[PDB]
Ligand binder design. Structure first.
Ligand SMILES: *Cc1c(COP(=O)(O)O)cnc(C)c1O
Ligand SMILES: *Cc1c(COP(=O)(O)O)cnc(C)c1O
Ligand SMILES: *Cc1c(COP(=O)(O)O)cnc(C)c1O
Ligand SMILES: *Cc1c(COP(=O)(O)O)cnc(C)c1O
Lengths: 474, 474, 447, 447
RNA sequence: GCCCGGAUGAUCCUCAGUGGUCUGGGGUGCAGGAACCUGUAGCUGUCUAGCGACAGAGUGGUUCAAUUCCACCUUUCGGGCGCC
């Protein structure tokens, strides 16, 4: 029954090794260098969860929001964190009914701030995780700016053909002013002259902010943030940066750091899933003025989900800063490999890799040898890649017209009205493996052969199943 | 190695019993009457998850959002659903990269619509789950209305002292017009005269909407929705109903149904955690015009978390419509029991249960025998209940001034400037057990004794630990 | 913050109370307390140490994360290679888990009706192999013994356990007393005198059994064993759930000799098949059985019952025992009603508190094969546990031929159907069984 | 929609290929395929049927949801009460699980070096009790046998397995050949002739062992057994991970007689302690051992290794075997370097492919108790698996007194330290061990 | 249990018929002018101090038009399958 050496022999001795990793986390708020063992991580989460009042043993609840859970499957999959984050008046305020969830939220934001520094923006002052994706999080930035600039109606926006970040300004109730890009070689870049010309035409007081973008599909490249930040500093206009998946790119993060160094960056927003390999649904709002970032936080009404914060807390504690650095290194290596592989394949089909050296993530291969008008070969290629279980291979044909929330885009998906050619997108994002590139190259090869010929074990099953899906669509 | 009767002997025979429960769900989109076994539920989720492209065996990904997951703990706790819900242009659109998640989202919304009908609003036309809490979801309603009424500046709002729903109109960029309530007996009720007078004073075209509330703390009661809906129909003003935790109240839901029957209700919003016992973070936007509800959905920019939808899908499939009906029945029974218990206890301390028959969820017990000015006894009671692990027991002292987003409230937390007395809140919400009431009554008894005396095993450990927490705060 | 750190104290009190007294909690633990306890135990094992390095052949390495998590990172099993009950220095948490589990199990055995039990231990083998371990222990104490005297019960595991241990079973036929089959005490004592006590390894009796057989006459057998100095081993496979079976074991130990009694973990505690409990009244003999086990053993059955008893509590287990009795009365009455409608009757077996039997005399197996059919149809309608017993079934088990197999005698008067009220049975179980049995008898009567 | 339904076909192909050939997949399954497979198997068991009602005593009821989920709802165990290998009609999914697991295990045994193996089965007992089951089976074939001839190895489980089965071990001392302790073939054959083949139950040899002992001379023993018609039982506890041990078993069966060889599941497949594999070359004899097991048994060890082999694949297991060899060379060289710095040496034991030994001659146990200290300090520094062997240690196991215990002989020349490269060992393990051993020897030398 | 095929649900009480905003026959009670003639009829939820009010007719679909036609569900009948 007993065999009891007081509490336990090693019950606190080797347990001390776990507590000291936890104590170092709470004291300095930094990512562990090497990842925690699963046992340490789950011991930490279990001890946090029992701090929440809904998990108290002697608790009784007479309110309308007591964190009750009907399904045990639901309660266990969330590690018994039910109360979310924040209070009804402040999403950043400690919740007296959920001290464990509040500590979870504070530690997660501290870990994320640490990662943003090592990723490239060392002068970041403040950040917080918000359980909305990047589009809605950009909207929250604009909603906050409205009260600071009540006469403003326009958001000046260098064009990028992505529906979420475009709609974010309309959802916030402002009028986007689409600044077309300038073609420099193969690259589409910021028209700094047109941006400043529009500021003078409309008047700075009528401008809510300038909305720039770093991460993007080639042949677009990250915006000229340093020059845009200087324009924003000179005319006293807020600068909001869409950095959706730029955390994984030291080049993108350094553009942000330099923009804040020489000019004005009020906030930059990044997706959680794209930069940390977690489910879709969360984002980080970061900036350099602590007071302003807290203003955006206080703009949020009501409590919020703790699930995205828990996901990234688990991820960073398991990976460590070394594990994340390793993922960033391999992403750079896989970009070179993917670039070289596309160079080799495009040569064999009389295509080429578009020359986009300023885009460190996305690549583009021309599709000039395909006739979309007659054979619809460009659209056929995208469908054949899809049925062959290639995902993320974005096909951009010429002359696509698209209306988004009443605004009509010419040459939609190409970020400009008349790009020289149609092309295919591919990218080296965090977590990509060599198998992804090799299978993509192999399957793109077969698709290019089949479309050019049509104008004139499990591998064959994926091919046989693709032929059935191809014929069903036809 | 084999012993193989083709595939299996019963491998499809008793499996058929599982498939037929699943086929009935997908065909009619209704809640099962009796809850599913856990085995059926998890088989369903596993088969949905393998439909998502990130879980394909022969998949390769070359994009920036491929649903990659670094941590196995994260992937398993979400049943391998990574891609979220929706597309970057439409949160309601099927995601070709996540056919399983898209089916999950559609079935969840169908189940939730079914529950809203059986809960009382049988004429509901459309609804969707949004992974934001009720405050942010109300903001999304106002953001959608802005484009339909671009000259509107004001939201007419019968006062309720809750920071989230108040801030939701300011976060959306509108000016709330606070309509004070009328005291009728002990109850605070809608001042229909002042609402119509403010409509005429400001002009209907300047009114974005009327923002009413059903579920609320006593002594406030649900707004007079039928009369407000008639005012809204006559002046052509949209009507938005805050039904945060009203789904659990057949009285609240019937007010909504009658309001739509005789007048105009454009949308009503309810919390997921408060009505379905799931983690905080999600809500339902429902209405009677299908086209308008889709407009709110399309206002959302970008993809969204699937975690709240998964939580309520698991919950409703496990509970069934019978299980949910049982929770609603027990909530009514526990309201009577809690009411009778407070009647008995308040008598022994020369207090009374406030007469609020029109509030079917929240109750209030007077605290007239406590002196807040001299002894601060009302604040002391709330703290003593907290240290004794009573949660949800809301103490409302007199004369509290509070500023929320620049607007100053007199008598804050009482929903009126000068309520006759201080009081204590308690409620019978879904999932409450008799132990909650008995422990609340027992601990409130000890607290009342201690505060009145101060002016003149685990039970004792909760008391001994409360005395230590009480002295530390002092 | 200060309330949350004081909230861990609430869990610590429950854990401390368990380590100090080793009794089941009265009310079951919350899952949060249980999993907290298990995680703290598992990190005491050396394979889960953060700075551990392993240069041996048994380091507790786990290749699959799915395997490690589902066992709460308990990898080293129980015991040492020289003693299954010894503390494993490389697995202090697993050793603590094994000691607590044995304590909780002893607590339940007393609660269930054998208050005078002295010792017991969980063994990760089922009841058959656990009876074998008992016989293997008795061999070294009685090296001239060759026979095991065994009142007949038609169950292959307990019968084979004697042959596996290397002894010759001596089958004692039962006596028909009314409808019941009971111990033939005269035939037992006659075989003791014929073969000689020194040649008898033990008397192997059985409590829990299928009707119309009833628990053996343990008191009279315990006196025979005491008079002749012959060990007594009781097969109590699923008798823990029956206060009548347990009190019968308690009485036999009071008036006579009972060396050990064995019970299945899955049949009495609703856990997966695989474990058993060896219990006795001589602490030293039970220890001798434990020390006869060679090498380490799986900790999975111990962990299953530990989780179950901590989640149920003694009140939760008491409730299941009370409901088993009420379900038995309900099942009995419903069989009386149904048997009346088909010109059958419920066999009068008041000495069996778990299993019942209903006559199948009106069904013709000789001409229509109707009795064999009924059990087949009962399966396809998904009635599990219903057991049809035809007449004159011959069956060979390890070379021994049984006549009238499944009936525990050579010529029982009639064929019959078995049904039982075991722990965890619901009113749905009986109502479904009655409905499907009615439909099954209608179709057989038509043809 | 059409691509997702075709996506289940990809998983179905892997599952279909497993059921059709019963071999390990070359590359490991994804967790999604594995858990899909397990869930489909579990719903085949009757306890998981949606319309099931239970009126029996063994219905597979589970009180705790934590217990049910952690076992993937496999509750009924393996086998029937009359045959552990028979298909359980109430648990078709569990029976299918057991058959697949035995097939995968047979595939690995061939892959590991015994290509001529005919049959094998997983038994949810550890290696000690599994050797006991072998001896218990041999008793009925050789009812006059009393002795088991056993080349000495100082391990309590395999030694006790002979006594548990009820036989007298005949300890054959080993021969010092250089630094190695090897089989004394002349003494073995002399005991066969002295005691008489008819009185010998079997010869019980051992492959995997601690240095400086080496695997037994299986070929010469297999010929002795064939000439005298004596069964041969091989203790291969952790020899599956060694192509040298497995090939030695293969060669012995080719030139002589080997009736069965037994191996631990945890030591060879990195799963929790609790299971073993009994394998042989006569399909009928292995079946006889299986049928000697009485009653049902736990399915937990089978499920653990099934998950592990499906997740690893044969390529994954091959990789672990290759890395064990490379880790052995690395550990050997690092011990050579460290022993040189302390005026010690690595004992030359080239016939042992798993375990190594380093001399501790410069440490004084008689005056300073330094040898006993080193093992103590090695533990507190969290070095597990390191094994110090002093001189002249006396130890009694089940009544038999060993002199020079832990050393496998009565007077080995010196004390020494044991270290091994077992499957799953990392370069961190060796580097940490060398560093901590260096610090441990520095402190002992100071005092 | 599953598969197949009839009917079944709350005005394939009752037996029938009917795509036409339902009809025929037998039967019961309540109400008046043995049985005859006439009228009449039940249930569930919600909101009410109550009168009463608001809905629902297994869930959906087709159609100008569903008691009627189609699919599925509930109940029930019949057939098939049966070493567990
Ligand atoms: C719960 C509730 C809300 C919503 O608050 P959130 O934290 O945003 O979910 C709004 N108003 C009232 C009256 C509420 O009870
Ligand atoms: C991912 C991304 C966004 C954000 O889209 P959400 O679905 O809201 O997360 C915005 N702009 C770009 C360029 C992106 O890549
Ligand atoms: C591991 C091993 C055994 C196995 O003993 P158990 O604890 O019963 O598994 C037996 N002999 C030797 C030499 C071993 O290494
Ligand atoms: C259950 C039971 C056994 C146990 O046999 P195992 O399958 O080994 O657990 C033995 N005898 C009887 C009468 C039983 O009911």
């Amino acid at each position: 029954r007993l065999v009891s050496p007081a509490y336990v022999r090693q019950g606190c001795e080797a347990r001390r090794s776990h507590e000291h990793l936890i104590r170092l986390l709470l004291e300095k708020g930094k990512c562990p260098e090497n990842g925690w063992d699963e046992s340490t991580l789950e011991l930490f989460l279990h001890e946090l969860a029992i701090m929440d009042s809904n998990n108290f043993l002697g608790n009784c609840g007479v309110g309308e929001r007591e964190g009750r859970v009907a399904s045990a499957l639901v309660a266990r999959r969330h590690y018994r964190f039910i109360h979310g984050i924040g209070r009804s008046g402040d999403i950043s305020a400690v919740q007296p009914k959920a001290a464990g969830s509040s500590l979870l939220n504070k530690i997660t934001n501290s870990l994320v701030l640490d990662i943003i520094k090592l990723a490239g923006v060392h002068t970041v002052a403040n950040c917080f995780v918000v359980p909305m994706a990047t589009g809605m999080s950009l909207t929250l930035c604009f909603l906050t700016l409205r009260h600071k600039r009540p006469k403003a109606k326009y958001i000046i926006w260098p064009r990028i053909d992505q529906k979420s970040c475009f709609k974010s300004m309309i959802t916030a109730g402002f009028e986007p002013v689409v600044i077309e890009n300038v073609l420099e070689g193969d690259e589409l870049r910021t028209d700094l002259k047109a941006v400043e010309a529009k500021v003078q035409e409309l008047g700075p007081d009528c401008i809510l902010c300038i909305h720039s973008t770093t991460s993007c599909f080639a042949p677009r490249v990250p915006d000229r943030l340093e020059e845009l930040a200087v324009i924003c500093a000179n005319y006293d206009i807020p600068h909001i940066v869409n950095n959706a998946y730029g955390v994984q790119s030291s080049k993108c993060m350094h553009l942000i750091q330099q923009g804040a160094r020489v000019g004005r960056i009020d906030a930059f927003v990044q997706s959680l899933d794209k930069n940390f390999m977690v489910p879709v649904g969360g984002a980080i709002i970061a900036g350099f003025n602590d007071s302003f970032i807290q203003e955006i936080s206080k703009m949020y009404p009501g409590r919020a989900s703790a699930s995205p914060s828990l996901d990234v807390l688990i991820t960073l504690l398991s990976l460590g800063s070394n594990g994340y650095k390793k993922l960033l290194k391999e992403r750079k290596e896989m970009f070179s490999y993917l670039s070289n592989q596309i160079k080799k394949l495009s040569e064999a089909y009389n295509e080429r890799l578009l020359h986009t050296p300023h885009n460190p993530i996305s690549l583009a291969m021309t599709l000039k040898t395909l006739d979309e008008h007659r054979d619809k070969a460009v659209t056929q290629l995208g469908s054949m890649l899809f049925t062959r279980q290639v995902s993320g291979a974005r096909v951009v044909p010429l002359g696509s017209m698209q209306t988004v929330s009443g605004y009509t885009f010419r040459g939609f998906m190409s970020h400009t009205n008349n790009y020289p050619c149609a092309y295919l997108n591919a990218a080296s994002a965090i977590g990509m493996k060599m198998q992804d590139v090799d299978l993509f190259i192999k399957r793109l090869d077969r698709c290019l052969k089949a479309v050019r010929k049509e104008r004139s074990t499990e591998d064959v099953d994926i091919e046989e199943m693709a032929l059935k899906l191809d014929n069903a669509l036809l």
